[PDB]
Amino acid sequence: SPRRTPQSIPYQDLPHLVNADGQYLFCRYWAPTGTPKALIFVSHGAGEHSGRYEELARMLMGLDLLVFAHDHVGHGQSEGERMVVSDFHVFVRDVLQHVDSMQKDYPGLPVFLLGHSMGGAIAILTAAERPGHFAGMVLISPLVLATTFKVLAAKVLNSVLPNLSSGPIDSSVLSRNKTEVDIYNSDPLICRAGLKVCFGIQLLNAVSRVERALPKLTVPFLLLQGSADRLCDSKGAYLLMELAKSQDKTLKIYEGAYHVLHKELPEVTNSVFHEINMWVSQRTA
Ligand SMILES: O=C1CC[C@@H](CCC(=O)N2CCC(COc3ccc(F)cc3Cl)CC2)N1
Ligand SMILES: [Cl-]
């Protein structure tokens, strides 16, 4: 019996790769016609999948970039227990595998990363693991940072039952655009389950690792952040601008905006799209 997605579609029918753990990841490509100027991997966030970057990805392909992506393990059309991972580094390992593959097939080309939220944390750790290799990083409200005993309490019963959950990601604080909160609450590829303690700990490892990595980054980046984000605190973006050694770093703050700036009120989203577009054009031209 052919291996199937968690939505029972056979992987022989979809673009895919197999990770070091023997798991199938669903892959997604937007290739320009004629020869590409650069490569860019798009790294999605927690609960979501590659499909949510359709718009951004089409805009990047339109600047003649080869845009590729995959669903992280335990997300989207990829394999694994939903929103669980053996160590956060699996995600980074899997991005590097996909990047190394794409580079083999398009040698010469600069490679960029775009990440949102958890996908931004993965973007940072990926660049930090191959210092000097990435041409640029586009970070949309990356996970860079919530109490002390809830931290200490987690790893206590991470031994007992780590399959206990806290609340789901609260969808009302995702975007002031209610159409996009509706779309989020409707997408059958989005896992809206509670946050498992075991996943909660990996997210804490990620935060911890990202903070140790910040002082070591040199990669150019564009950092977009909402001031009223209840999921990834604005202070994290300020901290990344403080600690990164990158000679080429830009912060744009969207006053009042929630977490998902690429799916916000259209004044914000159109700005987000325009800024990413200008910043990538200037660095591929
Ligand atoms: O378009 C979209 C749809 C989905 C959204 C992205 C969501 C995403 O990736 N999140 C948001 C929640 C954040 C929770 O963080 C923690 C939770 C518990 C914990 F114990 C320690 C941490 Cl650090 C992690 C990252 N954007
Ligand atoms: Cl890691």
Side-chain angles (χ1 to χ4, degrees):
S1 281
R3 284 284 265 296
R4 280 184 199 283
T5 71
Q7 311 77 38
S8 285
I9 307 166
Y11 285 109
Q12 23 167 255
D13 296 331
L14 308 169
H16 62 272
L17 72 70
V18 179
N19 76 3
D21 287 327
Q23 302 170 292
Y24 276 74
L25 305 195
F26 171 85
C27 294
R28 208 183 275 283
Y29 301 95
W30 311 255
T33 39
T35 189
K37 298 193 70 169
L39 304 169
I40 181 163
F41 177 90
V42 176
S43 170
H44 73 74
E48 63 158 1
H49 62 103
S50 61
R52 284 179 59 78
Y53 292 84
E54 241 296 307
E55 286 276 283
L56 282 169
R58 266 192 194 280
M59 181 275 283
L60 290 160
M61 174 228 79
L63 305 173
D64 287 292
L65 271 85
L66 206 184
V67 188
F68 63 116
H70 60 240
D71 296 343
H72 299 302
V73 317
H75 295 72
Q77 308 191 73
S78 296
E79 295 195 300
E81 206 195 313
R82 296 296 83 179
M83 296 193 59
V84 126
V85 60
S86 72
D87 184 71
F88 194 96
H89 182 77
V90 160
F91 293 147
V92 175
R93 180 200 73 195
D94 288 354
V95 173
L96 289 176
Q97 183 188 338
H98 200 167
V99 166
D100 291 347
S101 282
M102 287 305 295
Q103 291 211 270
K104 165 190 58 158
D105 282 330
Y106 299 86
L109 295 200
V111 48
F112 294 80
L113 298 171
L114 188 148
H116 167 53
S117 209
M118 186 190 74
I122 295 166
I124 295 157
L125 292 179
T126 299
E129 167 162 335
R130 299 265 179 92
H133 186 63
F134 287 100
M137 207 158 68
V138 167
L139 292 178
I140 304 172
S141 54
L143 173 58
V144 183
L145 305 172
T147 57
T148 295
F149 188 50
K150 289 204 280 189
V151 159
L152 180 52
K155 31 172 55 182
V156 165
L157 48 68
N158 193 26
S159 266
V160 180
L161 299 149
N163 275 4
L164 291 158
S165 97
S166 62
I169 290 159
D170 172 7
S171 84
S172 70
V173 305
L174 277 181
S175 178
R176 292 167 300 163
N177 187 331
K178 296 167 182 186
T179 280
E180 285 297 338
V181 177
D182 290 342
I183 282 168
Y184 172 84
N185 281 320
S186 271
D187 190 352
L189 298 184
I190 298 183
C191 175
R192 284 170 299 265
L195 177 67
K196 310 230 186 102
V197 160
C198 60
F199 200 54
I201 272 122
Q202 286 319 315
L203 288 183
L204 284 174
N205 291 336
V207 161
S208 153
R209 285 165 195 177
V210 160
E211 296 196 28
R212 281 204 318 281
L214 282 195
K216 216 203 171 82
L217 283 182
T218 59
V219 67
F221 64 91
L222 175 62
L223 174 53
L224 312 179
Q225 182 65 50
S227 68
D229 189 334
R230 266 161 280 199
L231 291 172
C232 294
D233 197 60
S234 61
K235 278 147 207 200
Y238 290 105
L239 178 65
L240 175 42
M241 221 79 43
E242 286 174 314
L243 293 178
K245 300 297 172 287
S246 307
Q247 275 285 324
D248 175 12
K249 37 174 162 164
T250 304
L251 179 60
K252 173 155 187 77
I253 296 276
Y254 291 94
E255 199 68 2
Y258 289 18
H259 181 55
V260 186
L261 299 169
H262 58 289
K263 293 181 185 308
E264 241 284 350
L265 303 182
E267 41 264 61
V268 170
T269 292
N270 305 329
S271 169
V272 166
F273 271 71
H274 179 63
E275 303 299 335
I276 292 167
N277 178 329
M278 289 319 309
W279 189 99
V280 172
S281 299
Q282 274 180 50
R283 277 164 191 76
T284 45

